[PDB]
Structure formats: C-alpha cells, structure tokens
Amino acid sequence: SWQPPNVYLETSMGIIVLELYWKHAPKTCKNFAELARRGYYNGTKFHRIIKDFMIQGGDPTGTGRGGASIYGKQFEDELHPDLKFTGAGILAMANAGPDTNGSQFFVTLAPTQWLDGKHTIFGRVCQGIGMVNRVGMVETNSQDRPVDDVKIIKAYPSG
C-alpha cells in the first residue's frame, strides 16, 4: 500500500498525470493499483463518451460489460461527505449499482451533485485538464461509442 498520488497514465491522446485520492477511498485505490500493476489496461479503449457529462472507459471489449477485480468479479463502493461530484475532471469508478464495482472507470465534466450518494469518487486530473476536455469532444453516436481507436497505450501505478 503506497500513496504517491501521481498516476503516469499513457493514453493515445497523451500522457496524463492523475491524482489518486488515497485520503478518502484507499480500497478502490489499492484495487486499481494492483490491477494497473498487473496491466489490465495496457491496450484498452474508451467506450461510452458523452459531451459535457462523462467520459467512460476501461472496457477491454469496449462493449460496456467487461471488468474484473481482485475481490471477486465485483467489490464495494466507498464514499466521503466532502468529496461530492462537484466539478469537472473528477475520476470515478464506473458502476451498475451499489455493493458492486467493475474494473471500468469514468471522469465527469460538470457539478453533478445528484450522483454523490451513489459512486466512488476515485481521482482527479491535475496535468491534462485540457487533455480530458479534448478527449471529451470525440464524436459518438446515440449509443455513445467512438469513431476510431482511443486506446490506453500503457498504464503505470506510479508510487
């Protein structure tokens, strides 16, 4: 269990440094540390991309179903009463419903307060907020799927 907060994620758009919040949810941070250590994402494409609401990825299939954890196939949601979905660039765990978490993830684009009591607020981007704003402008269909490959080159859980 380490907590240097920087994450040296290497994507097709560019290298983004992501600040993990080991302060508020160490469990999901340790699970993604273990998985990105084992390289679950070295060559995974973002799947659901919505303008001004969220950018979702982490699906190896890209079909909105793939995901596997160390605590079973699914693990637990965690919260904090001062981290709320308020702002852009807010990394979080992609989810179906509570008491369940897949390996997928997403970031948001706006103060989205009605989702604070649901999902694990998992990180935030510090270098590369223009990067995630540029990635947020990929054209997608009504099924929210991209045009060409936008794929994670390499993952590093730096710390």
Binding site: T11, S12, M13, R134, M137, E139, D148, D149, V150
Partner: peptide, 16 residues
Amino acid sequence: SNALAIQVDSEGKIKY
C-alpha cells in the same frame, strides 16, 4: 454550438 466540432486525431495532426 454556432461553430462546428473540431477534430484532431489522438497522435497526429489536425484532421480535415
């Protein structure tokens, strides 16, 4: 918006 949607690929130059 009023303007179009600006698209550049992930790696290379500006797509037209």
